[PDB]
Amino acid sequence: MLPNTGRLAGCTVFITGASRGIGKAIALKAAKDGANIVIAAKTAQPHPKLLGTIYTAAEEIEAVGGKALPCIVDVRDEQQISAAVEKAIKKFGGIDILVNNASAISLTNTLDTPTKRLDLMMNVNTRGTYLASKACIPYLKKSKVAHILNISPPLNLNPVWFKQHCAYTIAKYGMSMYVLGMAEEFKGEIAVNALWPKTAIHTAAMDMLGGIESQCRKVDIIADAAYSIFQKPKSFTGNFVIDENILKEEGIENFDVYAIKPGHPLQPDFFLD
């Protein structure tokens, strides 16, 4: 795998959706440098259907070397975003990295999508990423690292990605369009980039959406790609990174260590031709 480096020692990483899955896995990689992880997600109490809370994530994060600040945050509510940001500053003194990882998905089409799901996608994905970015920016300006990373895809405008689940595509594409804009707006001050996985990534949310277990990569791959980006200087900006591509640059050749079952065919991720 791709080894930790120390770069992030004492750096504060604010990650939306770090209660489980990819978000949590990014936290754990940054955590191994002795980073401080601000966990911004909704799950404060055991739910019968989801696994893990902000508090179990916090524990995991401490067990591999980091400090964790669990905050209850629904990114649909600006007040909860700004309260967690304030808690991060009071506690840690600053924010050096924001990862906009929280998202909601519904693969329905025009007549199928209930308005409450439309709004949920628009409001968690596009709106959430904007507000989380707006709150963190004034602190990112002061960071020696200063990275914003959106988990969202390259802007691939082939009609095939819109013919179905259009609402979901627009919601995700909006996060990547903020990359396009904010990279330019904050050139020299904040690096802003997207990261997206070449393949499906094993996750209890992807299991529910997907038999699919064996066709996936480990969350380790995205964690590791995201760690690579975090070490780049502030001039690394306006990019739409794909996990596999960024790790080939860093010397990784044998990708089997990242597969759930080495050998088996892997499911292409959405939005890549």
Ligand X SMILES: NC(=O)c1ccc[n+]([C@@H]2O[C@H](COP(=O)([O-])OP(=O)(O)OC[C@H]3O[C@@H](n4cnc5c(N)ncnc54)[C@H](OP(=O)(O)O)[C@@H]3O)[C@@H](O)[C@H]2O)c1
26 in Cβ contact with 99 (< 8 Å): yes
Candidates 26, 30, 73, 140: give the one binding ligand X (CB under 6 A).
73
Active site residue 258: no
Q: Site mask, ligand X, residues 178-207, x = CB under 6 A?
A: -------------------x--xx-x-xx-
Rounded to 5°, the CA angle 38-100-165 comes to 140
Q: Which region, judged by CB under 6 A, interacts with ligand X, from 70-78, 135-143, 238-246, 257-265?
A: 70-78
DSSP for 70-134 reads: EEE--TT-HHHHHHHHHHHHHHHS---EEEE---------TTT--HHHHHHHIIIIIIHHHHHHH
- Residue 148 binds ligand X (CB under 6 A): no
Residue type, 193: N
- Using CB under 6 A, which of the segments 1-9, 100-108, 159-167, 185-193 binds ligand X? 100-108
Among 151, 223, 226, 242, binds ligand X (CB under 6 A): 151
Of 69-77, 87-95, 229-237, 250-258: span binding ligand X (CB under 6 A): 69-77
Total of chain residues touching ligand X, rule CB under 6 A: 28
Q: Which residue is nearest to ligand X (CB)?
A: 21
- Options 168, 173, 178, 258, the catalytic residue: 168
Among 11, 13, 14, 19, binds ligand X (CB under 6 A): 19
In the DSSP assignment, the letter for residue 263 is T
DSSP SS3 for 69:
strand
Residue 173 Cα to chain centre, angstroms: 14
- CA gap 273, 269 in Å, rounded: 10
CB 247 within 8 A of CB 2: yes
Of the candidate residues 30, 31, 98, 102, the single one contacting ligand X (CB under 6 A): 102
Cα 163-101-61 angle, rounded to 5 deg: 150
Q: Which stretch binds ligand X (CB under 6 A): 17-25, 82-90, 155-163, 186-194?
A: 17-25
Which residues are known binding-site members for NADP(+)? 17-23, 42, 74, 172
Q: Which residues bind ligand X (CB under 6 A)?
A: 16-17, 19-23, 41-43, 50, 73-76, 101-104, 124, 151, 197, 200-201, 203, 205-206, 269
- Catalytic residues, by residue number, are 168
